[PDB]
Design a protein around this ligand. Structure first.
Ligand SMILES: CC(=O)N[C@H]1[C@@H](OP(=O)(O)OP(=O)(O)OC[C@H]2O[C@@H](n3ccc(=O)[nH]c3=O)[C@H](O)[C@@H]2O)O[C@H](CO)[C@H](O)[C@@H]1O
Length: 241
């Protein structure tokens, strides 16, 4: 089947796209059943390595800067809503600085009988209890959730599921941020604080171990599968804006 993979890279984050694109081929979508379709949102005219592979689709999108670039990601997925219904069956989002290390496959695709959602544990909060989750604790916010509840702390570096179930997600949170905008609030950990609520209302069919979000340099009780490139390396410099 045809699986769609969402990817955002604006400003200088187009430096991350390449090693990701190559790694995606080596490891993602290996066995013939599956065909990969890149949906890239960039300011830039040119994306590596284009021309050559049809599937990859460059989608024009300007720079909104921090924090709007991760806050309004879901409005970015809806500019092309109708397109995602005819050309895709499953959806996924990968962080710009992600990288593949070990093969992937059908193990991450939600069963069709379930809700059809996917989340991933956060690498820093997988060994911690509810007391330490960094949700949003302001009542007037749509991302408000108090103490003693919430099962996990999901990260926004990876999320997906069936196209239907994921678009409804995209459409849901789009209102939630917009509603906050009229209430004059910006959530603390905007991509996540919003998402964690949604995964609280409707917990994903799958929760992926932080092996799929492996920070570089770290020592975890896991085998690397998908990796997080370290931004404070002198090649990247923390700062892109
Ligand atoms: C996994 C995690 O807990 N990390 C945080 C953050 O990672 P970091 O704060 O470590 O990285 P970041 O916020 O610079 O990256 C945000 C991601 O959004 C996209 N992008 C692209 C171009 C651009 O100009 N700005 C931009 O934000 C891009 O794919 C990038 O990977 O981002 C995650 C992805 O949502 C979450 O939101 C969290 O806030």
């Amino acid at each position: 089947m045809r699986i769609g993979i969402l990817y955002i890279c604006t400003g200088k984050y187009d430096i991350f796209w390449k090693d990701f694109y190559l790694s995606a081929e080596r490891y993602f979508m290996q066995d013939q059943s599956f065909i990969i379709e890149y949906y890239v949102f960039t300011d830039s005219p040119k994306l590596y390595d284009e021309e050559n592979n049809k599937h990859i689709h460059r989608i024009k999108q300007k720079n909104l800067g921090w924090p709007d670039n991760t806050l309004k990601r879901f409005h970015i997925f809806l500019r092309i809503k109708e397109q995602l219904e005819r050309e895709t069956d499953y959806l996924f989002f990968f962080n710009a600085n992600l990288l593949f290390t070990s093969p992937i496959g059908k193990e991450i695709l939600p069963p069709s009988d379930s809700n059809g959602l996917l989340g991933t544990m956060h690498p820093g909060f997988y060994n911690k209890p509810n007391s330490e989750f960094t949700y949003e604790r302001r009542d007037a916010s749509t991302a408000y959730i108090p103490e003693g509840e919430g099962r996990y702390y999901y990260a926004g570096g990876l999320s997906g599921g069936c196209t239907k179930a994921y678009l409804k997600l995209c459409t849901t949170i789009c209102s939630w941020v917009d509603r906050d905008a009229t209430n004059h609030i910006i959530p603390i950990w905007h991509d996540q604080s919003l998402i964690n609520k949604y995964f609280l209302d409707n917990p994903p069919a799958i929760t992926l171990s932080p092996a799929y979000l492996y920070p570089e340099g770290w020592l975890l009780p896991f085998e690397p599968i998908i990796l997080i490139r370290d931004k404070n390396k002198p090649q990247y410099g923390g700062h892109e804006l």
